[PDB]
């Protein structure tokens, strides 16, 4: 209801972004 849904989709958002970071790094070290 409150930050329940709003704060969740936030971690999830940041999670995804954190994966893309992972990828950029591993290309950039080839």
């Amino acid at each position, epitope marked *: 209801s409150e930050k329940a849904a709003e704060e969740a989709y936030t971690r999830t*958002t*940041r999670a995804l*972004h954190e994966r893309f*970071d992972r990828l*950029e*790094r591993m290309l*950039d*070290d080839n």
Partner: antibody
Amino acid sequence: EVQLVESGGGLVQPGGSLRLSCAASGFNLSYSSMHWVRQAPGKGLEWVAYISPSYGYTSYADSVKGRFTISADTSKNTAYLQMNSLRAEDTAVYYCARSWEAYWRWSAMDYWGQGTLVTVSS
Amino acid sequence: DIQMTQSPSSLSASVGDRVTITCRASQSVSSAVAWYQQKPGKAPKLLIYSASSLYSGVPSRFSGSGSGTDFTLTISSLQPEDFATYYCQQYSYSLLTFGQGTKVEIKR
């Protein structure tokens, strides 16, 4: 005129709240992105936070997360740093810098404000 | 979690001298590095991004190198207005990190 001006810096008791702003001009803050970095008296540079308004992306340094909140208002083309629970060690000059790209990792911090001082004692 | 070890802490040099400041990233940060210049009471000024890409307007004397995880900022010749302190930065991780600073002073 592409400039960065920062204000709202002042004196606050420990545990108090302050709330800074960084007025943006000569570019669209929303099309791009920003950082608050800070500098304890007599010490080095320290990353505080970042935001890509149009990615609705925000990120933080551990030494906060849960006391500071960074925001944007497209209307005023302005960035905010809301600091609650301020300590003496949060004492420091706080700067803005733009980052020309829309994500923190594709560009460095090109333009910077003059920095406003935040002293915190009891 | 990524430390940037800067070296040296301080350094004396003369006008015309070629100076080198180094930065050891504690783990690959792969090219995502910048160097800043800061004068007392003034904002930092961006010199090199991408571990060695000249920022527009910056004097071509300034230069950046990178060798795996060691980064060098070179100044081919050293003019008056270049006395300052310089910081490397990594921005390869969402926790951006700055080195502790090198003071570049006038050797008299």
